[PDB]
Structure formats: C-alpha cells, structure tokens
Design a protein around this ligand. Structure first.
Ligand code: ATP
Ligand code: K
Ligand code: MG
Ligand code: MG
Ligand code: MG
Ligand code: MG
Ligand code: MG
Ligand code: MG
Ligand code: MG
Ligand code: ZN
Lengths: 175, 135, 118, 47, 50, 59, 217, 76
RNA sequence: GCGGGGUGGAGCAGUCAGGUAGCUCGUCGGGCUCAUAACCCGAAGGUCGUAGGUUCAAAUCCUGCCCCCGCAA
RNA sequence: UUAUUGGAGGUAGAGCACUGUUUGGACGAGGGGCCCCGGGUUACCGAAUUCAGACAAACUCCGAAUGCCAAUUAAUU
RNA sequence: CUGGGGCGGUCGCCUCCUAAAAGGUAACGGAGGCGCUCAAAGGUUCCCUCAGAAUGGUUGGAAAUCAUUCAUAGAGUGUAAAGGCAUAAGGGAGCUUGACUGCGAGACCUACAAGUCGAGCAGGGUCGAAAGACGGACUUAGUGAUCCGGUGGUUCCGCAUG
RNA sequence: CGGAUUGUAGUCUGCAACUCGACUACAUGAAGCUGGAAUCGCUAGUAAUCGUAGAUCAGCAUGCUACGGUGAAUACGUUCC
RNA sequence: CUGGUGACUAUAGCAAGGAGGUCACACCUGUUCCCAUGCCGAACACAGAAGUUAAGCUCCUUAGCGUCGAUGGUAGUCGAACUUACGUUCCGCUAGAGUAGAACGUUGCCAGG
C-alpha cells in the first residue's frame, strides 16, 4: 500500500507545513476517480457499446455502469433510455492503483507530453483528463480493433482551492 | 405599435370606471401629459401624437411613451346579422383613466414642451393637462 | 466535496414513517435512536408527548465492553422488563427511519421474546 | 387490447372478466383469484 | 388471404384465372365509384356557386 | 465487490528495465511485468530533452 | 382497394467485384463417409463471376461437397479473397435468440435502419423483427437466413437448397437477384426451370462420378 | 364555429359546515386533489372526497400556511 | 375567409396503408457524320417548398409558416 | 330576521412573487453584414443579469365588503 | 337547434374562463380534449429526489454521456385543462395479484332512470419483522337504456306422470 | 506487379537549372487486374516485339530520321461497307 | 446545559463571522461474518476506537436576503338618498402595498451533568 502510506506520511507532512493547517483533518484527499466513455455511435450500431464496455472492464478491473439518456435530442437522435456508453467509479486501493498505472506508466506513453494542463479545474479543486489514445493502457491489444474512442477521467477531491489541488497532485507526480 | 405575441386574441373589453392603478407620477422626464378623462387609445393615435411632438421638436429632444396597447378589440365583418361567434381583430388599445401619464418629455424647455404636448393632446380622444415633476 | 448528514437523511425518513404511525397510551411507539457507539431507546405516547419508558446502552448495568449487537438485544430486554410492569402489552415499532436488519432488528426480537409481544 | 374471461382450473367457473393486450400478453393468461365455490384462492386461466 | 379461406373448384390454373378476373372486376368497380364521386362533388361545387 | 461480474484482478510488479523502475500494483495481465517508458525514463519527468542555416553553413 | 403489400425486393449491400482469374480450385477430393464412395476423387475450379449450379438426385452428396468447400482442405485450394456466405439445408440460425435483429446483426455490421429496412422489404414489419426465430414459418426462416448471409461481408455465396419453402413471388426476386449478382454463387436446387435464368457452369453428380459443363441448353 | 361546449358541473365544495354535527360516512368536502387534507376520523376517498368515519363535530383546521385539514371530533 | 396543391429544367407516378425517389422528354461529355438532327455509350441533376415534433425508419403521419390555382371578398 | 362566534371560498381592489405582455436605461453572450487568422462596427441585439415604471377573464406573493353553511346561545316573529 | 329560414356549425361526455370569493347559472361567447391506455404505468415493502445555469473535460452550442457547486420547484406526474403531489400521488428495485367474493350504516348530486363517495362486518389472502396497507391507476372523461338473440353455470319451473 | 507523386541528399552542363534541364541514391509507392459506343495499322523477313545510331544540340527526345536481332497468323473469296 | 422525541403559521429560516469536544454526536480504522450497491464497503450494514475538532453537530453576536407586521390614510364595498354622470352625497365595514417596528425561536416528556 505504498501510495496510501506515501500520502499519509510524506505528502501530508509537506502540504500541512506548506499551507499551515490547524489539523490533519483539514487535509484534502481523493474521494473518487470517475471514468467515462460517452459514445453516441450506439444509435448507429450497438456493437460499439459492448466493445467499449469490455475495454472499460479490462482497464479498471471492475465492470462498468452503463449510462443512459434522460432527455431526447433530434440532432443526435438520442432518446430516453438509449445508452451513451458508460462510466466507472473507483475509490479505495483501486483508486491508487489506477493513479499509479497512469502516472508511472501511461502518461509517459503520451506521444507529445508537454507536462499537462494547469487550468483544468472546475473551480473547487477537482480535475479532468480528456484522454485521446485509449490504447495507452496495455490490455486493449489494439490489433483486434482500432477505435480508441478517447476517454474521460475525473479525479475528485476534498480540497477547496485549486491551489491545494495542484500541490497535492504535484506530490502525487502529475504536472 | 403592437405586441409580438399574445395568448388570447379575443379578450373581454376592459373596464373604464375608477382611476389609475398607476402611471400617475411623472418619472423619467421633466414634463408630461396627464389625462383628465377616460377613453381608449390606439396604436394609430399614439403614432400620430408621437410624430407630432417629434416634428415640433428638433432632433434635440427625448420622448417616453408610457402606455402600450396590450388589449386587442374586435369588430365584425360588415353587413352581418348578430351572433355567430366573435369577430376578428382590427386594433389594439390601451385604456386610460384620469391621472395617468401618457407621454413624458425631457430634453427641452417648458414652453417647447407645452406646445408639443398641446399639439399631441389634439390627436387623442382625451382631455389632458400639462404636468411637471413633484418635490 | 460536501459530506452528507446521515442523521438528517434518517430524520427525513423518520417523518415519512411517522406520517403513518403515531402511537397512543393504548399502544405507544418504541422510539429507537442509533449512534456509531451505541443505542438509545424510549417508549412514548404521542397524544401528549409523555415518554412512558426508556433504556439506553450508555448509563446502566447493561453497559459492557461489547458494542456488538448483543448490547442492542440487552437494551431490548431492559425496556421489556421496565415496561411490562407499566401495563404495556402491545406497541407500534418505530423503525426510526433506520433499516430493520441489524441492531434495530436485534432489539425488536429481544422485545418480542421478552413478553412485549407486538 | 381485448376482453378476457377467466376460469378456475378445478371447477371451470368463470368468476371474473378483465382485459388484456393480445400483443403484449398474448398467451393464455393465468392468475390466482378467489373462487367462490371452493372458498379458496385458486389459479384461474383464461378461456 | 387474411384468415379468410376462399374455395375454388378446379386446378391452380383455375385459381389464377378466377383471381385474375376478380382483381379486375374489383379495380373496375373502384374506378367507377371514384369517377362518380368526383362528378357529384363537382356538381355540388357549381350549384353552391350559383 | 460482487461475484460474477468482475474479471480476475491480482497483484503485479511492473518494471521499466530502461532504468529498472521497479514498481508494484494490480492489473489484469496474468507476476513479472515490463515497462518501456516511465517517470524515471521519460524526457519530461526526467528533465532531459534530446536548422536550414546551420545546414547551409555546413557546405 | 385491397391494401396490397409492396413486392419482394432482395438486396446485396455491395460487392466490390475483382473478377480475378480464379476463386476456388481443388484436386482429387476423395468423396466418402465410410464404406461408401459417394463420389470419385475429382478436381474442380471456379472463376470470377460464376453462377455455378449443382444437380443431383437424393443421397448423392451435394451437401457434403458443399461442406468440403466450407470446411477442411482435402484436395482443395482456396484464397483469402473469397468469404463464403453459407446458407444451409438446415436452419443455421439461433432458434430462441430473442430477435431476428440479434440473430442477424450477429454476423453483420450495418445500421439498424438499413437492416430493418431490408427486413421490411422481406415483409418483417416494425413489431415483427423482435419475434423469436423458432416461432416463425419456414419460408420466413429461410428469408432471414438469406438476409443474415447477405449482410455478412461476403463475395461468394454457397446455398444448399434455397428456394425450398419460399413462395412463388419471392423465388422470382431471388431468381433475378442471382441472375444480376456481379459475383460468384454456388448452390444446389432441383428446379431446372429456376436454373434456366441462373446457371453458367452447370454440374451433374450421378453414378458415383461427376461431370461439369458450361451454359444452359 | 369551433367552440361552444362545456361540461356538467360537479357540485364541489363544503357540504357540512364547521361546528356542525355529522354522522358516520358523511361527505364534508368534495374536491379534486387535496385542496383540503384529512384530519382525525376523516378519510380521503379515491376521488379525494372527505368523509367522516365516526359521528361527531366538524372542525376545519390549519396544517402550515398553505395546507388545511378537517377533523371530526366526538362530543359529550 | 373556404377548398385543393408545391417531387431534378418541363409534365406525371409514388402520400390513402410510413421501409434505400421512380417514368418520358430534356441537360452535360463522348461517339457516328463533310457538319447539324436523329441514333449509340456514359454521367450529372432532386434538404420531395420550408421549420418543428412522433418513429429504428418520413415525400409519406401531426404541427407551424411562405407561395401557386380557383371561388369568393 | 337580527346580535354573537366559527368556518369554507380567491371576487372588486391591489400587486408582479410565477405565466405571458411591455417601456426606457446600465452591462452584455456571442453571433451577423462588411474589411483586412485575429481584429474592428454610430447595428439585431436571440438571450442572461440588473435599476425604474407599467398590462391581464382564462397570472396571483396577497386579499375585502357582501352573500353562504351552521351553532346545546339570546331577542323579535 | 338557430337574432326568419337556409348554407356553414353543432347535437353525447370531460376540464378551464364568462360565473358577479358557497353551490348553481345562459348565448351560434371564448380556448382545448374524449370514444383510449397499463399485466404493470396496478397492490405492497424498501430506497431515491428533479429540471435548468456556471465551471472542468475527446467525437464539441463542452446542449449526447460525466464531475462538482448553485438551484424549493420552473422537471416529471401515460394522455386535454384545472386542482393537487417534492413529509411525495414523481423515479428505481424485490415479492405478488385486493384490477377479490357477499354486502353496506350514512352521505353528495338528483325531476326520473342513472351517477358518485363510503367507513365497517364476514370469508379467503399478497406484501411487510410488525403496526398496518390493499375492493385498481394523483383526481376528474375514456361511454349506450329496453326488447331481442348468442355462450356458460344452476341443491329453479317444466301444462296428467316421468 | 506497376513506378506516378512527393521528401531529403547529391552529379553534369552552363553566367545561372524557382518559374523551367536532364540524371542518380535513398525514402514513399498512387491509378491501373487488359478497356463502352466506336475505331486504327498491317499481306512477309512485313505485322509484332528488343535494342542501337544520328541531325538539331553547351545541356535536355516517350518525338523525328535510320539500323539491325527474333519472327508470325491468314487470305475461303468478292455477297456486303 | 447536552442528547433523544413531540407541539406551534420561518417572529423559528438563509447568510456572514466566531467558538467547543474522549462523558455525547461526529468525522474516522477496515470488509472479518449478517447485509449491500444496473460498478465501487461512497452509501447501506457490521468488528471497531488508533486518531481529529477540519467538517457535520451544537452555542454566541450581527438585521444583508427571506418571514411576520401595526396606527393613520387610501382604493374598494353591503346599505341608504340624489341622479344617468366613464357618477356624486351619508353611514358601517375594510384592503393590498408600504412606513415605524417585531424577530437570529419558544415550550412539553424522558435519560444524563
Ligand atoms: N452420418 C452419416 N452416417 C451415414 N450416412 C450418412 C451420414 N451423413 C450423411 N450420410 C449419407 O450420405 C449421403 C449424403 O447425402 P446429401 O445430403 O449430401 O445429398 P443431397 O445431394 O443433398 O441429396 P438430397 O438432399 O436430395 O437427399 C446420403 O446417403 C446420406 O444418407
Ligand atoms: K381631443
Ligand atoms: Mg379511482
Ligand atoms: Mg382586476
Ligand atoms: Mg382576475
Ligand atoms: Mg340565420
Ligand atoms: Mg332578423
Ligand atoms: Mg361560484
Ligand atoms: Mg309433462
Ligand atoms: Zn373453482
């Protein structure tokens, strides 16, 4: 549980010395990671669904929830009940396993890595990756199929300030 | 002058008794026109009056109409026995009760304002008087 | 993130239960309150707001080191003994806005088994 | 969507009328309903 | 056809022949109906003008 | 964690032998594992980074 | 009027035909099961655009000949271009798979509106494509098999007893489609009068031996 | 013209006033929806009528500023 | 105000009963020919007036709007 | 019938708290015509927000007088 | 029927307003719907709370799906409108068939015929640990007299007797 | 298979190869699976195919002019164009 | 005083600031059996108490939003007397808005101190 331990001792030390909190329970943590795939090509063909559904499972080690429309639109021909692919929620040791399997592994597999954004916080201390090349996870085996689909990751935290978000993510290893 | 859209084109024709629910105290400008009597006022009358004032005054001048004809009114086709529904629309009216300010004007002296609003008063079905602001 | 008050969602549920069940002297209701440490319990008529009995897992000879569900069972026995005297044979169980699976269920079974038969 | 007569599977008495989609519930539909002769709640199919 | 069992004395050729004549008879009667209706509606319109 | 929906997901030990960045985690590979570029091998995280004018003045 | 149904119109989504010098070849295919010479070891070859046919009495081995084509290479020589569409003499579909849609879309990668439109040309309406495949009548099972095997990505069709339960006014659409198909077809049928339009390389199995000529007569 | 219709009226409203003696099963307030809620010894019908269940005396009451109720209380 | 219609350039089917937009003439390029016409071979040309909904699917059903034809006025 | 008490109900009025209408302003949310990817505009401003003033049978945050329904009450009839 | 008749329109039912703060109230007065639907969109037990805006984020109005914060109702409530529902009547899940039998004090409306509500008793039950809920649906339309004939059942008669 | 196109690096000529020469090496590797209605040439060392040479010319030829190597098929016959 | 739980039209609320904790309640440690999530022990539930008052909770102050809200006066109006005027006169009731102002809750039962 290397990264839990890392966070608890070293990063907590650094960050509370930095921000001068009155207690540890002020310190921000991560409540969840949320993956999304968000694909409207299933109006066309539903094989698309089961494909990305399987790849999400392969990545996160757990089956994904299928998201569904709630309202209908005529441009995309999207209607209440037709799924738009899937999400996943992750919290626990799965959270940290996924964090590391990004930072140590696949974000170095970026083709052109100029750090990563300093702006992509909503304004509460909570971050998104809009990922392009979904096969930078190993287990896809992208010979069989080539629609990467991209992906969205959403890290969610108990921080107030985007500053604290940046600094905690820095202590994780994210630019 | 019309509304762009209304829910019910065939309304009841409004009440004329009483006095103003508001629009009595001159607000925007310096001078105004105040009804002493009750009648209806139309798009046509308003256009005419506003034209009259804006011609009597040079480009130096500012006008605020203070009423709008929300309420439509009907008239039947010609040479038609009574009944058989309710007629089409032929106009739009603002009701006016005594007290209410019809026009307000700012960018001039009181003599010019008096003459302009005098010229306009003759193009409405209503007796008017000339108003200045209060304390 | 804003964290959520379990007590408040519970009480919002409690009200929906209490819309139906109210109690009376003929049969009062068995108030139940839970906490991460231990349980409090009352038996009350709500025509007058007059708690007819009480027992708690806090201040008693019931208090022991096991905050196990058995301590809930003993709260049940305690209100059973302390209430059967006062002429209370039947009652309306209050779920409390909790769920009837654990400590709540254990207290209820205890009270049933201790003569305070619903 | 059509009219439906039920009937008890141990006497043969109808005892109930109702309605059903002939599309969505196409089969000979069956439900447990009181039967006034046996004085027991009994399985009643359609006829 | 649509649950209606039509019966036909003879051979499959006779089926073809009989159904052919029946199709033809039906189309003709339909054309007659449409034509007549058209005519009477036109009459109605003229008479209303007057 | 239910039973019947999750695939196998056990512990695994990654390795960037380009610097032997040897690391522990969990995955679905089925426990000796390769890595090719990582934090201690990538130009950003490691800091390192590998003209017509010059080309013309060569000649 | 009678609400007259629109006619049968079958489709083949596309064959980007290449017409190259040969599609199939094989040599000395020992035709037997056990103790029975069903046919002699013989060669064969099928070329770009061939409306190959087969004619044989009962218990000959036409079906097994087609099975040798579709599986195994004993004395056979295939290429990676040919992608067979196998229509069986049996069902070949999933009986209680919960929709014609599913059982078809299993083997094809096309849009829902095109596939339901093709089914509608076959006269399987909006609320009928969710019917189970066991419930169905024979002729419409045959039609659904054919649609699945069309919208399969294929260029050569392999049809053991089509036209079998179908009706006189879909067999004509099928006649014309096969007449007009830019690609290769191989098939069995006992209807010489159906074959009159279709065949270009007629075959004949008999007396444990084989013959193969070209054109009709 | 495209109009000229309306439906029968249904005689909604109060049918037994306040401070009044009422027998069981007596309609009090026919309505549509809970224009008025029930109270004590009052039931709400399928069509939202309000009927007494016991003999007694009617009292319309308050239930929080946009919500009334009605209670049939016994007498002695 | 009432009633019918608007589908490549022209005229017509298809709308009733929703399932891949069709017919004749024409247009464009090429052929034949001393050249043009005819004729032969290919190809373009259609948000089915428009804007909204229903539908897996709209020329098709529903809504709204702009024109066209008669009647009237 | 009146006195008293209580009660249901949404009218005239009034108001804009929703529904729609509407004036003049302050910003604007970003488009559009036009000029040279970006940047301009004596302009629509679809909107959002806000200040002030206004409209309503089928709007109401509010809400009369009357009328009504009754009362273990009194009086006159 | 009808501001003569006639044409045009309408004829029965449901909801608003006219309708004058009980109820009721007309007109060829103004606006709209109905002639169904649902074996769950019913019953019950558990749980959940929306729409919309700002921001961050791939296929980009970032409108598809996601994350957060705001947001008390502007969503949804099968379907017209009104009255109501967020202590849910709205949305999911598990089990079931009370969309039961015989009735029914007392009431509303009411010319009549009809229509509506209905506790409660008994029988035999689904759900819930129990209390208890349940004689369809958030409510109000979603219908058609008698004669006649058809079908089934029956401790009913059966032209002297059977 | 074919070798278009484009990228880089080079060689020769020249007063200088952007417009605008040829050539090379490397990289890339398009269209094209023997051509619709129509239509051309050829009767023998011809047609067909493979190379070579030369004038113009600093340099540039799939063209022109000329050379050889291999080497056919058929001509019933004049009914038709 | 804390906690539980009822009652009253938010005068009770929203908002801002500040404060307290091992006796409560909380966050909190984990999925160990009951139990559970169209996926995750987030939730639900359970074995817990190493840890922290940060947050939730509760308490103090403030009248910025919301709520409540007079008197006086006004519109309106039953009735009456005159008259037909887009009305007046007399009496009785009596708004709505607003203005001053109220208010940052109060009690009832029970276990603890
Ligand atoms: N498993 C088996 N065991 C024994 N004999 C078999 C087996 N399978 C097939 N056969 C025989 O092999 C021959 C196969 O006949 P097949 O179906 O190929 O003929 P066909 O040309 O399709 O004729 P048709 O369909 O008109 O009968 C027949 O004799 C059949 O009886
Ligand atoms: K005048
Ligand atoms: Mg009902
Ligand atoms: Mg008014
Ligand atoms: Mg009003
Ligand atoms: Mg008349
Ligand atoms: Mg007359
Ligand atoms: Mg009334
Ligand atoms: Mg007899
Ligand atoms: Zn029975």
């Amino acid at each position: 549980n290397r990264l839990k331990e890392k966070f608890n001792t070293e990063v907590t030390e650094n960050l509370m010395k930095k921000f001068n909190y009155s207690s540890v329970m002020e310190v921000p943590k991560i409540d969840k990671i949320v993956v999304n795939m968000g694909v409207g090509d299933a109006v066309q063909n539903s094989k698309v669904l089961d494909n990305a559904v399987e790849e999400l499972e392969l990545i996160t080690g757990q089956k994904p929830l299928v998201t569904k429309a709630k309202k209908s639109i005529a441009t995309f021909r999207l209607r209440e009940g037709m799924p738009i692919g899937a999400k996943v929620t992750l919290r626990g040791e799965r959270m940290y396993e996924f964090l590391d399997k990004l930072i140590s592994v696949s974000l170095p597999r970026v083709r052109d890595f100029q750090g990563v954004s300093k702006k992509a916080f909503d304004g509460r201390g909570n971050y998104t990756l809009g990922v392009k090349e979904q096969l930078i996870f190993p287990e896809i085996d992208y010979d069989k199929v080539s629609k990467v689909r991209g992906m969205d990751i959403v890290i969610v935290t108990t921080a107030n300030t985007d500053e604290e978000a940046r600094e905690l993510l820095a202590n994780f290893g994210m630019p | 002058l019309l509304p762009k859209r209304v829910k019910y084109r065939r309304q009841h024709r409004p009440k004329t008794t009483g006095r103003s629910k508001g629009g009595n105290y001159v607000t925007f400008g310096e001078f105004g026109l105040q009804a002493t009597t009750t009648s209806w006022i139309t798009s046509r009358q308003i256009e005419s009056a506003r034209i009259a004032m804006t011609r009597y005054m040079k480009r130096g001048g500012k006008v605020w109409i203070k009423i709008f004809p929300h309420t439509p009114y009907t008239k039947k086709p010609l040479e038609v026995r009574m009944g058989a529904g309710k007629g089409a629309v032929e106009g739009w009216i603002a009701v006016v009760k005594p007290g209410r300010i019809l026009f307000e004007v700012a960018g001039v002296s009181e003599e010019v304002a008096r003459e302009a609003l005098r010229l306009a008063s003759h193009k409405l079905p209503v007796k008017t008087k000339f108003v200045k602001r209060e304390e | 993130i804003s964290k959520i008050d379990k007590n408040k969602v519970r009480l919002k549920r409690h009200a929906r239960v209490r819309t139906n069940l109210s109690g009376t002297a003929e049969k009062p209701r068995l108030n139940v309150y839970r906490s991460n440490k231990h349980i409090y319990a009352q038996i009350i008529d709500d025509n007058k707001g007059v708690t007819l009995a009480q027992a708690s897992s806090k201040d008693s000879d019931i208090a022991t080191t096991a905050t196990k569900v058995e301590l809930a069972t003993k709260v049940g026995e305690a209100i059973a003994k302390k209430a059967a005297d006062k002429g209370i044979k039947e009652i309306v169980f209050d779920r409390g806005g909790y769920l009837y699976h654990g400590r709540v269920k254990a207290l209820a079974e205890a009270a049933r088994e201790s003569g305070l038969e619903f | 969507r059509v009219n439906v007569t039920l009937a008890c599977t141990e006497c043969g008495d109808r005892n109930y009328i109702t309605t059903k989609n002939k599309r969505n519930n196409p089969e000979r539909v069956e439900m447990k309903k009181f039967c006034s002769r046996e004085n027991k709640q009994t399985l009643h199919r359609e006829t | 056809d649509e649950g209606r069992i039509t019966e036909y004395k003879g051979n499959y050729s006779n089926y073809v022949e009989q159904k052919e004549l029946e199709r033809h008879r039906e189309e003709l009667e339909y054309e007659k109906y449409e034509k007549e209706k058209k005519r009477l509606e036109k009459a109605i319109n003229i008479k209303e003008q007057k | 964690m239910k039973q019947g929906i999750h695939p196998e997901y056990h512990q695994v030990i990654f390795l960037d032998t380009t610097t032997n960045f040897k690391f522990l985690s969990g995955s679905t590979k089925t426990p000796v594992i390769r890595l090719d570029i990582s934090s201690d091998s990538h130009p950003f995280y490691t800091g390192r980074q590998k003209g017509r004018v010059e080309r013309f003045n060569k000649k | 009027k009678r609400n007259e149904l629109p006619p049968l119109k079958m489709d083949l989504v596309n064959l980007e035909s290449v017409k190259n010098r040969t599609i199939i070849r094989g040599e000395d295919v020992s035709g037997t099961i056990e103790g029975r010479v069903l046919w002699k070891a013989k060669s064969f070859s099928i070329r770009g655009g061939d409306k190959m046919a087969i004619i044989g009495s009962n218990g000959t081995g036409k079906t097994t000949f087609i099975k040798k084509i579709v599986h195994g290479n004993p004395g056979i020589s295939l290429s990676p271009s040919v992608k067979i569409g196998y229509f069986s003499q049996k069902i070949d579909t999933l009986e209680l798979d919960k929709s014609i849609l599913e059982n078809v879309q299993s083997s094809s990668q096309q849009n829902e509106t095109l596939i339901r439109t093709i089914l509608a040309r076959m006269h399987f309406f909006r609320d009928d494509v969710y019917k189970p495949i066991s419930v169905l009548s024979g002729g419409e099972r045959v039609k659904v098999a054919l649609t699945k095997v069309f919208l399969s990505e294929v260029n050569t069709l392999v049809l053991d007893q089509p036209t079998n339960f179908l009706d006189m006014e879909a067999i004509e659409a099928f006649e014309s489609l096969l007449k007009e198909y830019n690609g290769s077809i191989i098939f069995v049928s006992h209807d010489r009068k159906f074959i009159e339009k279709v065949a270009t390389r007629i075959m004949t199995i008999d007396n444990k031996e084989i013959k193969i000529f070209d054109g009709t007569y | 013209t495209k109009n000229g219709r309306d439906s029968e009226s249904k005689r909604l409203g109060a049918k037994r006033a306040d401070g009044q003696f009422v027998t069981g099963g007596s309609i009090l307030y026919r309505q549509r929806g809970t224009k008025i809620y029930p109270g004590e010894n009052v039931g709400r019908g399928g069509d939202d009528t309000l009927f007494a269940k016991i003999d007694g005396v009617v009292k319309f009451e308050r239930k929080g500023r946009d919500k009334k109720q009605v209670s049939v209380y016994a007498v002695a």
